Amino acid sequence: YNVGKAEKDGEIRLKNGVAMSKEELTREDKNRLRRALKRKRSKASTNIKL
Amino acid sequence: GHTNAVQRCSFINKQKQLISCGADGLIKIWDCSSGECLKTLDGHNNRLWALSTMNDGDMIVSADADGVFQFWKDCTEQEIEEEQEKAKLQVEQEQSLQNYMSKGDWTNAFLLAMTLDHPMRLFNVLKRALGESRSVIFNEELDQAISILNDEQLILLMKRCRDWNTNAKTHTIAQRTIRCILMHHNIAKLSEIPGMVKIVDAIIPYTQRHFTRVDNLVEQSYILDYALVEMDK
Amino acid sequence: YQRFEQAAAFGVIASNANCVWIPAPGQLITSALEDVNIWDIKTGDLVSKLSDGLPPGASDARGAKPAECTYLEAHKDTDLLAVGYADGVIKVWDLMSKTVLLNFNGHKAAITLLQFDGTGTRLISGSKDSNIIVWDLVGEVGLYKLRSHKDSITGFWCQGEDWLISTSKDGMIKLWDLKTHQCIETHIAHTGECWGLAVKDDLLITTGTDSQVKIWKLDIENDKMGGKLTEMGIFEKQSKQRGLKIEFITNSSDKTSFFYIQNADKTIETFRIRKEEEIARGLKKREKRLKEKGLTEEEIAKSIKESYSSFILHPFQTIRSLYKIKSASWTTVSSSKLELVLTTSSNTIEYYSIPYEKRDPTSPAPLKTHTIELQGQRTDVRSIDISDDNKLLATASNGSLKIWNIKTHKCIRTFECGYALTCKFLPGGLLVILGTRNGELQLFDLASSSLLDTIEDAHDAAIWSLDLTSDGKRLVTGSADKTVKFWDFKVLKLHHDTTLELTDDILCVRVSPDDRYLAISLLDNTVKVFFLDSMKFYLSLYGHKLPVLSIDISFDSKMIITSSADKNIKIWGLDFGDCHKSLFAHQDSIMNVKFLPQSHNFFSCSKDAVVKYWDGEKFECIQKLYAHQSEVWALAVATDGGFVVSSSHDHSIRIWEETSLKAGERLMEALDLGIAEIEGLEAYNRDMKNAVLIAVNKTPEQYIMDTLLRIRMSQLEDALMVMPFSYVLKFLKFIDTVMQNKTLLHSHLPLICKNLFFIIKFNHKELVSQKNEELKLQINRVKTELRSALKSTEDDLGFNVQGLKFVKQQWNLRHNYEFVDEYDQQEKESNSARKRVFGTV
């Protein structure tokens, strides 16, 4: 067993085992996590005149 | 968008929407202003020769050729009523959930997190609650709270214990919760919960590793004895 | 070159912000784009105009459009005005000195609401970026940020330093503890967007998107873990549109309370709060009416709750205004009458007075007492002109034509005209001639202040453009009816001379200065140049992708410019129809282009709110002017060339006038600070029988512990190796102290172990040689609980592994098929067993 995807789309699950629901996350965290996702994926006549 | 011939067309919601029945047996609800399919209703297995409406289409009745009648009813406002109420409840639980931690009422906050299913907040509840315990397992109130957990909530918790176990930095929180479960629940019942075994089967190998470690920490700690006996000489 | 600066900007009475009424009917404070106007409601004249400085177009002026005011708030006691701008910048203004005092910058979007505390030292700001920040006026700093909201702040209430209530556009009403900076309660006010908030004692009322209005009680000292706010009851306002603002006012003499729910539409709906005696009176009679009707007591009890709202609130009166309202404020409250002041989106202020006696008003409708409309014009100015004297500026719009004075900036005359599109002065500046959209042509005289002649069938379609010969005796009129008509001036009346029919619609018509050419734009994206004297077709310019909107011809009749909606300015040599260069000037359609007289330099205006100063011969943008907030519809240039006049969609007329430690080393400083204090307290306690730590708010045990965490593992073994022995005794004394606090020990047990045992192994030889008994006891203490703390964890791990095997063993019993033949059992187990694929070479 290796900790992988979140089965519920709402949840976010990482390889370290930390799990996260999108509701709890403050807005800045969501941005930070979204950016973290981005880098990880990258490595792998009337109208006219008036 | 109809796969086969359309045999009926009717306006509903006054001008806003249109409903059509086809030989395919699919009833499609269209948007007049945009011409886009809002919904598809599938209650037949053959061509539909009849389609009758009432109250601007608040009640819809469609017939299959085989002789099957589907009596559709508008429920948009009802579904909107349900989600509003469900949403109103959800906000109250969350706001309470944050508020309890700031006070530190762990026994309650565990329940709200368990219901709302916030894996982070649940973890912080157990961790800093466990911290207070260091100064039977967690505390009398919360241990009772775990005991009352039903079959669904145990599976969700044991899933969280499984993942936390895999990480060497958070396993201490996992093992004590698992210990609380075995000590306050009928072991016979836990076995019969479907899927608990596959969850359990994953817990054991990680647990054995954590036992091999720590043990070496006790072993390798005996250097302090050897330091002491030297000093006595 | 010489620089163009904004000499003045007028024509704006009230922009898109809130209005502040100040007693002397008294004055009013209103927003005028980047400037705030103080008016005298009695006289209708401007009192003073507040302008920060940095006039647009100057080098020091920023190259971006000015931030417009969005909210105004004045503290009457102290005479301060704090102004919120669309950039998120709050400027505290001195009314007496008419200067900026403070400049707060803490928001990323438009400021939506502002509110002084009662004592007037603390300022609370809510911005569209969903943040409520509390500012200190004497402190000149942002104290704390309230961030729970997830959308633009629509309303909040904070009358007491303890508590703050807030709304937002996301449908949440939230409570805030000012002393904790945290959100206590949360309710979903309205199904959609929650816009309004007003509070009187416990009573609280908010407005959603629909006509529904909610009533809540504010039991601030409830303290039950809930219910400090509870929904009381709902009532429906007449207007189906959203309610943006709500305000209370109390009559001192009669203790009566009134409130209005400012809608989005042209309706303001006033209300009264019934007195407590009135409620009990009403309740008793209604019980009788239902009891007479024969309902059961239980139904009566429910019905009184279902009819709860009716008892407190009385729909008092509805103010109907011709023009959409923007914001409102109560002005005076008295037994005799009730007075309101409001602003519209049509650039006007309205003062409404309501006389009333006891329950209901005396009049069916409110009495309109004062209005400020002279110094501004309701509809956007579509075409402007400058008189040859360069003294009188004519501004023509839908429904009205006004005439302005450039030196004094005070309007002289006003005429009611059709949907104006194009206006020009006749020579001498005594008459004006206008082009209506419906096809009519109007002639006015300034001296008579009356319209002289009307030609109702001048064109069957809109007269898009109109121009005069230099002589001023002939008139050329271009219309959407695909025709051009020449009119002569004979004593004054216009005689139609001849018609020129074209294939397509006509947008602009420009007669060259020497009256030898006639340039005709068309809708097929082609500009046709004719010979004025003989009307012989001369050239056909081609190359605009969208229709040409404006044309102009140089003073020497050599260069002709074409400006089109395709965002291009093309300069054409008139001799041969050659285009010198095509300029991608503006980001949106370019509306008007004019040559500076006696030169080839020209000005250009577009929908992007930008006016640009070009150089005719080198073809480069000399300067960019950012002053208007919206579309710049029309542009004019003085005959002398001293100034250029631009009027825009924001109802504003603007005049442009010519003028370190490494790992190991950090740990040592951590040890010295922490253990200096720990020894200090121990010595202090023994006898009884620092700045860094307080700043971080951590106990000495934690402070060093955190530093150990920050050290990366790849450096940790090397960091401890550098350590002299004298710090190891300090380090051992640290672990001893950490052992007492059992929470820390198990939080960081694996880390403490690895560092501790490594310190002992490395300098073992020196450790044992020391004969210090006290060190011996510490190793005794540090030893014992380290085993227990480790064994405690080990005991947990052992119990769980054996039990989970038992559970796995027991399920394996009930539900697992078993084969007596062992060979069959082999195959079953192999199929059941998990399989994983591994890449192999």
UniProtKB/Swiss-Prot annotation, chain A:
It is found in: Nucleus, Nucleolus. Coiled coil: none annotated. Involved in nucleolar processing of pre-18S ribosomal RNA. Required for the early cleavages at sites A0, A1 and A2 during 18S ribosomal pre-RNA processing. Belongs to the MPP10 family. Component of a heterotrimeric complex containing IMP3, IMP4 and MPP10. Interacts with snoRNA U3. Component of the ribosomal small subunit (SSU) processome composed of at least 40 protein subunits and snoRNA U3. Interacts with the SSU processome subunits EMG1, IMP3, IMP4, KRR1, NOC4/UTP19, NOP1, RPS4A, RPS4B, RPS6A, RPS6B, RPS7A, RPS7B, RPS9A, RPS9B, RPS14A, RPS14B, UTP1-UTP18, UTP20-UTP22 and UTP25. This is U3 small nucleolar RNA-associated protein MPP10. It comes from Saccharomyces cerevisiae (strain ATCC 204508 / S288c) (Baker's yeast). The chain holds residues 496 to 593 of 593 of the full protein.
Curated annotation (Swiss-Prot), chain B:
WD repeats lie at residues 1-42, 44-82, 92-133. Present with 8070 molecules/cell in log phase SD medium. Involved in nucleolar processing of pre-18S ribosomal RNA. The chain holds residues 573 to 815 of 817 of the full protein. Interacts with snoRNA U3. Interacts with MPP10. Component of the ribosomal small subunit (SSU) processome composed of at least 40 protein subunits and snoRNA U3. It is found in: Nucleus, Nucleolus. The lineage of its organism: Eukaryota, Fungi, Dikarya, Ascomycota, Saccharomycotina. This is U3 small nucleolar RNA-associated protein 13.
Swiss-Prot record, chain C:
Present with 9620 molecules/cell in log phase SD medium. InterPro entries: G-protein_beta_WD-40_rep, SSU_processome_Utp12, TBC1_cilium_biogenesis, WD40/YVTN_repeat-like_dom_sf, WD40_repeat_CS, WD40_repeat_dom_sf, WD40_rpt. SUPFAM superfamilies: Nucleoporin domain (SSF117289), WD40 repeat-like (SSF50978). It comes from Saccharomyces cerevisiae (strain ATCC 204508 / S288c). Keywords: Nucleus, Repeat, Ribonucleoprotein, Ribosome biogenesis, rRNA processing, WD repeat. The keyword GTP-binding does not apply. Involved in nucleolar processing of pre-18S ribosomal RNA. Pfam families: Beta-prop_WDR3_1st, Beta-prop_WDR3_2nd, Utp12. This is U3 small nucleolar RNA-associated protein 12.
